[PDB]
């Protein structure tokens, strides 16, 4: 209800009390979503004043009021976030993290969270001014059970944003010193802390083998697999995403996931009521069956293959696509014995029914899978037996249906398969 000018007057005033009233009047105007006069405040050159107030240790109200108004500005337009950053707000917030006032510190943590969350540029900039060390210091406590719930969530969310986004990815050295704290947070009992922490790890593991390697070496994977079987969907989702990303790495990094007892959990994931979970879990399976033969064998030992033909047969189409890729990788890198087992699990008919799909890439992948199964049949000298096995179902008739020059990629693929075998 104040005029923007009344605010400029009170702030430019000599009386610190009148400056506080003005700063508070500003907050109420900026905190109002729909419609804050953000631009009007910035134009008035009020940001350098707010940043100056952050340093007033002898007055926590003006610190809190100005910090609030600042984060409100840094929430809207990107250009408005830049106005706050160019005002020198980041170093001021960092100097506020070690404040003896819990609510002031919390205010600064939340501020750095918003800024870093708006983009990879602001993120790295918050990291550069030395925000990481004070942030972790606030969590350098023996047992975190002695910390307030809201206080810890706020801190975990900021840390999460320091881990998020790409182009460029978070500086390697920052991730190095943040990670040991993320492992501890993963052993907390609060579901919101766990969710944010799993998301942070999923961001970190969403990169090259070097990044995955760092995450895996902390010994945090067994804990991820524990959360993988939690009741809260908001935890299972990011946990599963993290495992899916790690499994996208090297064969040895994948092996850590298997040794952590992940495979025994996937029967429930593949049959989870949420289709999104089936999708992610099937996708993870795909990358695991793309690994070594002894790793495929461990997938077999856990009785996962029957579950795999099941989703390939009944799951929704986006999950089925993931299942197709999982099968093709299995037939691609698997042994003769393993491929015979796959066929005995009844993979053929479900795989042949997807040949009616209107997705060129999928059709080609399935034809490659059938080719790999035939190659396994060659080494055995039972190519002719598999041929009839495909004639039992609509298989042959469905491969012939692909011989349409409307799609000459699919034509050549199926034709190459028909000339032999059949």
Structure description:
- By secondary structure, this protein is mainly α.
- The protein has a single domain, classed as Alpha Horseshoe (Leucine-rich Repeat Variant).
- The chain contains 28 helices and no strands.
- The chain has helices spanning 4-12, 16-31, 38-43, 47-53, 60-73, 78-86, 89-94, 102-117, 120-128, 132-137, 149-161, 172-185, 191-204, 209-217, 221-227, 233-246, 251-259, 266-270, 275-288, 293-301, 304-314, 317-333, 336-344, 348-353, 360-378, 383-392, 395-400, 408-419.
- The PDB classes it as transport protein.
- Keywords: Arm repeat, All Alpha protein, Armadillo repeat, Closed dimer, importin-beta, NLS-carring proteins.
- The assembly is monomeric.
- Crystal structure of closed dimer of human importin-alpha1 (Rch1).
- The protein is Importin subunit alpha-1.
Estimate percent helicity. over 70%
Secondary structure class reads mainly alpha
Order of helices and strands: HHHHHHHHHHHHHHHHHHHHHHHHHHHH
CATH class: Mainly Alpha
The CATH homologous superfamily is called Leucine-rich Repeat Variant
CATH architectural label: Alpha Horseshoe
Protein name: Importin subunit alpha-1
Subcellular location: Cytoplasm; Nucleus; Endoplasmic reticulum membrane; Golgi apparatus membrane
Keywords: Acetylation, Cytoplasm, Endoplasmic reticulum, Golgi apparatus, Host-virus interaction, Membrane, Nucleus, Phosphoprotein, Protein transport, Repeat, Transport, Ubl conjugation
Modified residues (Phosphoserine): 416
